[PDB]
Swiss-Prot record, chain A:
Record Gene3D superfamilies: 1.20.58.480
Annotated gene: IDO1
Name of protein: Indoleamine 2,3-dioxygenase 1
GO biological process, one term: L-tryptophan catabolic process
Molecular function (Gene Ontology), one example: electron transfer activity
Cofactor list: heme b
PROSITE patterns named among the record's database cross-references: IDO_1, IDO_2
Record comment: activity regulation: Activity is inhibited by and MTH-trp (methylthiohydantoin-DL-tryptophan), modestly inhibited by L-1MT (1-methyl-L-tryptophan) but not D-1MT (1-methyl-D-tryptophan).
Gene Ontology cellular component terms for the protein in this record: cytoplasm; cytosol; smooth muscle contractile fiber; stereocilium bundle
UniProtKB/Swiss-Prot annotation, chain B:
Job description of the protein: Catalyzes the first and rate limiting step of the catabolism of the essential amino acid tryptophan along the kynurenine pathway. Involved in the peripheral immune tolerance, contributing to maintain homeostasis by preventing autoimmunity or immunopathology that would result from uncontrolled and overreacting immune responses. Tryptophan shortage inhibits T lymphocytes division and accumulation of tryptophan catabolites induces T-cell apoptosis and differentiation of regulatory T-cells. Acts as a suppressor of anti-tumor immunity.
Induction data: By IFNG/IFN-gamma in most cells. Exogenous inflammatory stimuli induce the expression of IDO1 in antigen-presenting cells such as dendritic cells, macrophages and B-cells.
Gene Ontology molecular function, alphabetical: electron transfer activity; heme binding; indoleamine 2,3-dioxygenase activity; metal ion binding; tryptophan 2,3-dioxygenase activity
One Gene Ontology biological process: positive regulation of T cell tolerance induction
Cofactor(s) the record lists: heme b
Pathway involvement of the protein, from the record: Amino-acid degradation; L-tryptophan degradation via kynurenine pathway; L-kynurenine from L-tryptophan: step 1/2
Subunit structure: Monomer.
Binding, heme b: H321
Cellular localization per UniProt: Cytoplasm, Cytosol
Modes of activity regulation: Activity is inhibited by and MTH-trp (methylthiohydantoin-DL-tryptophan), modestly inhibited by L-1MT (1-methyl-L-tryptophan) but not D-1MT (1-methyl-D-tryptophan).
Note: IDO1 is the target for therapy in a range of clinical settings, including cancer, chronic infections, autoimmune and allergic syndromes, and transplantation. IDO1 and IDO2 are 2 distinct enzymes which catalyze the same reaction. IDO2 affinity for tryptophan is much lower than that of IDO1. 50% of Caucasians harbor polymorphisms which abolish IDO2 enzymatic activity. IDO2 is expressed in human tumors in an inactive form: tryptophan degradation is entirely provided by IDO1 in these cells. IDO2 may play a role as a negative regulator of IDO1 by competing for heme-binding with IDO1. Low efficiency IDO2 enzymes have been conserved throughout vertebrate evolution, whereas higher efficiency IDO1 enzymes are dispensable in many lower vertebrate lineages.
Family: Belongs to the indoleamine 2,3-dioxygenase family.
Protein name: Indoleamine 2,3-dioxygenase 1
Length: 365, 366
C-alpha cells in the first residue's frame, strides 16, 4: 500500500510532479526543473518513501526529456535531478528511468482506506497531461496484475504436490491457476471504459517511452554530473512485471530460451524490476519442471488441467493483440506523415507474435 | 564425478569423427564425412552423463565443420543430420547448440589413474581439434583453476548461515577461507605457461572456440538445417560461461551485471550458456542477503579485512589474467600481418578492464 507523501524536505520535488499537467502546458516545466537544487537522498526513511521518491523523479525525468511530446526533446538531464535520481536508482538496483513497478505498482491509492480495491474506490498519484487517460490506464493495468497475482499463493501448492506425489492436489491447483488467468482476462475488458484510443496513442504514450534504440535520442540520455557519456535505457512496459513473466516460467514455456530478440527482451526486463521481483522469477526457474512432470504421467485430467493454464495465456495474449490493434495500429494509421516500435523498444508486432506463438507451441495434445 | 568417455555403439559414427578431427581436418576430408552422415535419434542417450558427452561430441564436430581448417573457408550451413540431433539434444539440456565452456572444459577430461588425485600429470582430455593445438594443456589447466576456485563453493553456505546466526567469528574464518581458495587458484593458473604455446593457441586452436554472434565471417549466424528456417546467432565459448568464476562477484556484492553496459550485458547473457543448475546457483546466490552490506554495517575491522582479502584476490586473478591476454592474444596478434574480439564476442580489452575496475571499486575504503 504505497506512500502518498515524502518528507517536507523534498517538498520541492513533490510540487513539480503533482502539478505536472499544467507546468507542461505552460511551457515552464523545463525551467522549474532546471531551477531546482540537488537535494540529497539521505533524508529518505523507509522503503515506502524510497519507492515514492523514485516514482517522483521518474515522472519528472520523463516530463523533462519529452516535454510537450510532439518533438521538442532534451538530450541532457540536469544534475539537479540526474544525480539524486541515479543515486536512488543504484540503491534500489534499478535503471534511472520510469519502469513498470514505479508508474503502475507504486502509483496508486484507495479513496476509502478500508473498502475493496475496485476501480471506483481507487486513484493514481500522478498524471502527465490533462485528458491523457493515465488514471484509467495505470489502474486497469494494476487491476489486471492484482487479478492474476491471485495465483501466486497457489504456486507453492503446485511444487509441494509434485514432490509429495499428490496427483489430485496438483490437478486442483492447476485448475485454480487457470481460473485466476481467466479472471485477469475479464478485468482486462475494463480498459475500453477508461482509456481513449487517440488520447493514449498521441498524449500518454510518449511519456512512457525511453532512450534505448530510439531515433530521437539515438545515443541515450546524459545524466549530468553522474556519467560523462550518455547511457541508453528502455522505456516502460508490462514486460517489466514479474507477475506476467511468472506464468511462462511456472509452466515451462521457455520464453527466455533460444537467443532471439523476444527472449533477449524478456530477460533484459528482469533488471528493470525490483530485486525481489527478479529473485522470485529466479526461484521459480530453480524448481523442477511442472511441464515435465505432467508430460510423464500419462494422465488425461492432469494434462487437461495443465492445458487450461496454457490456453488461458494464449487467450490473454490474443486479446492483448486486439488491444494493440485499437490502441496503437489504428491510431497510428490516422495521423499526418520503418517498423512500429513499442515503448519498451521492441519491433512490437514480431515480438508479440513470437511470444504468443511460443505459448501456443506449449499446448499438450 | 567423472565425465563419461564412451557413447552407446549406436553413436559410433559420431564418436569416430570427433575422435579424429586432427586427421580429418588436415586431410581435407572432415566436411565430406559429416555431409555423408546418417541422422541418428537422440533417444538412445539414456542418462545425463551420456547426453553431456553427446553435446561435447556434437559440439566439437560442429566447430570443425563450420571452421574447417580455420583460415577462411567457412560453412554457413550445418547439415541436417548433425543439426537436428544437435539442436534436439541442446533443447533438452537448455543450452544453445554451440560448444560452450561446460562442454569443452567441464566434460572434456578423464583421469589416468582412478585412485590418484586430480593433478595435471594424472589427467587427459577427450577431444582435440588439430595436431600441435595445445588443447590438452589448455583445457586441463582451465579445469584445474576451476577445481581450485570451486573448493570455495562449500564454504558459501557457512557464510550466509554465519550471517543470520550473528556468528561473527565463523563469518571471518569463512571469508578468509574463500580468499585462500582464490589465491590457490591464482597459483594453479601459472601452469598454463608450461603446457600452452602462445602461437599454437592463437593461430591454431582459438578459431575452434569462436562463434557466430557479432562475427564478421558469419554475419547472420549459422543455419541449423532442418530445424530452424532462418540462421541463428550464438556466441563462442569463454570462461565467462563458468558459474564458478561469476559466483565470487555475486557473493561479494560486486554488481558486475548492473548498469546496462556491455560488460554487464555479456556476463548476464553467458548465464544461459551454462547448464540450468549452474544458472540457478548464480541467481540463488543473488537471492541471499548481501555479505557486503553486512560487513559494512558492523564496524568490525577484522571482518572488513577478511572481506577485502577476497576482493583483493579477485583483483589479482584478473590482473594476472590481463597478462595472459597480453601473452596469448596481443603479442601473437601483433606478430603476423577494428578492435580485438574475444572468442566470446566482447571487445576484450575494454571488457576485461571494465570488469577488473568494477572489482577494484568494491574494496573497502573504510
Ligand atoms: C493500451 C494498452 C496496451 C498497449 C498498446 C500495449 C502494447 C504492448 C507492446 C507494444 C508491447 C511490446 C513491448 C514494447 O516494446 O513495449 C507489449 C508487451 C507486453 N504487454 Fe502490453 N500493452 C497494453 C496494455 C497491457 C496490459 C493491460 C497488460 C496487462 C496484462 C499487458 C501485458 C503485456 C506483457 C506481459 C507484455 C510482454 C509480452 C507478453 O508476455 O505477451 N499490456 N504490450
Ligand atoms: C590463454 C588463456 C586465456 C585467454 C587468452 C583468455 C582471454 C579472455 C577474453 C578475450 C575474455 C573476454 C570474453 C571473450 O570475448 O572471450 C575473457 C573473459 C574471462 N576470462 Fe579468460 N582467457 C584465458 C584463460 C582463462 C582462464 C584459465 C580463466 C580461469 C579462471 C579465465 C577466466 C576468465 C573470466 C572469468 C572471464 C570473464 C570476465 C571476468 O570475469 O573477469 N580465462 N578471457
Ligand atoms: N508498451 C506500451 C506502453 C505501456 C503499456 N502498459 C505499460 C505499463 C508501463 C509502462 C508502459 C506501458 C506501448 O508500447 O504502447
Ligand atoms: N576467450 C578466450 C578463449 C578461451 C579461454 N578459456 C576458454 C574456455 C572455454 C572456451 C574458450 C576459452 C579467447 O578469446 O582467446
Ligand atoms: O501479452 C499478453 C499479456 C499477458 C501475458 N501473460 C499474462 C499473464 C496474466 C495477465 C496478462 C498476461
Ligand atoms: C504492455 N506493455
Ligand atoms: C577466458 N575465456
Amino acid at each position: 500500500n504505497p506512500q502518498e507523501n515524502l518528507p517536507d524536505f523534498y517538498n520541492d520535488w513533490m510540487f513539480i510532479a503533482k502539478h505536472l499537467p499544467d507546468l507542461i502546458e505552460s511551457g515552464q516545466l523545463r525551467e522549474r526543473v532546471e531551477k531546482l537544487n540537488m537535494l540529497s537522498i539521505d533524508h529518505l526513511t523507509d522503503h515506502k518513501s524510497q519507492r515514492l521518491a523514485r516514482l517522483v523523479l521518474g515522472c519528472i525525468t520523463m516530463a523533462y526529456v519529452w516535454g510537450k511530446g510532439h518533438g521538442d526533446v532534451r538530450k541532457v538531464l540536469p544534475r539537479n535531478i540526474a544525480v539524486p535520481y541515479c543515486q536512488l536508482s543504484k540503491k534500489l538496483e534499478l535503471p534511472p528511468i520510469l519502469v513498470y513497478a514505479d508508474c503502475v505498482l507504486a502509483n496508486w491509492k484507495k479513496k476509502d482506506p478500508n473498502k475493496p480495491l475496485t476501480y471506483e474506490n481507487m486513484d493514481v498519484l500522478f498524471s502527465f497531461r490533462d485528458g491523457d487517460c493515465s488514471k484509467g490506464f495505470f489502474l486497469v493495468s494494476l487491476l489486471v496484475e492484482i487479478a492474476a497475482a491471485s495465483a501466486i499463493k497457489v504456486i507453492p501448492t503446485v511444487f509441494k504436490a509434485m514432490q509429495m506425489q499428490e496427483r489430485d492436489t496438483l490437478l486442483k491447483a492447476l485448475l485454480e491457476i487457470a481460473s485466476c488467468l481467466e479472471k485477469a482476462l475479464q478485468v482486462f475488458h475494463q480498459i475500453h471504459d477508461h482509456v481513449n484510443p487517440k488520447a493514449f496513442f498521441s498524449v500518454l504514450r510518449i511519456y512512457l517511452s525511453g532512450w534505448k534504440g530510439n531515433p530521437q535520442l539515438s545515443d541515450g540520455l546524459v545524466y549530468e554530473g553522474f556519467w560523462e557519456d550518455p547511457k541508453e535505457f528502455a522505456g516502460g512496459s508490462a514486460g517489466q512485471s514479474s507477475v506476467f513473466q511468472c506464468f511462462d516460467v511456472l509452466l515451462g514455456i521457455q520464453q527466455t530460451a533460444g537467443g532471439g530478440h523476444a527472449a533477449q527482451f524478456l530477460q533484459d526486463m528482469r533488471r528493470y524490476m525490483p530485486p525481489a521481483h527478479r529473485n522470485f522469477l529466479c526461484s521459480l526457474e530453480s524448481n523442477p519442471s511442472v511441464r515435465e512432470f505432467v508430460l510423464s504421467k500419462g494422465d488425461a485430467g492432469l494434462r487437461e488441467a495443465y492445458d487450461a493454464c496454457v490456453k488461458a495465456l494464449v487467450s490473454l495474449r490474443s486479446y492483448h493483440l486486439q488491444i494493440v490493434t485499437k490502441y496503437i495500429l489504428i491510431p497510428a494509421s490516422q495521423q499526418p506523415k520503418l517498423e512500429a516500435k513499442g515503448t519498451g523498444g521492441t519491433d512490437l508486432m514480431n515480438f508479440l507474435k513470437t511470444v504468443r506463438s511460443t505459448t501456443e507451441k506449449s499446448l499438450l495434445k
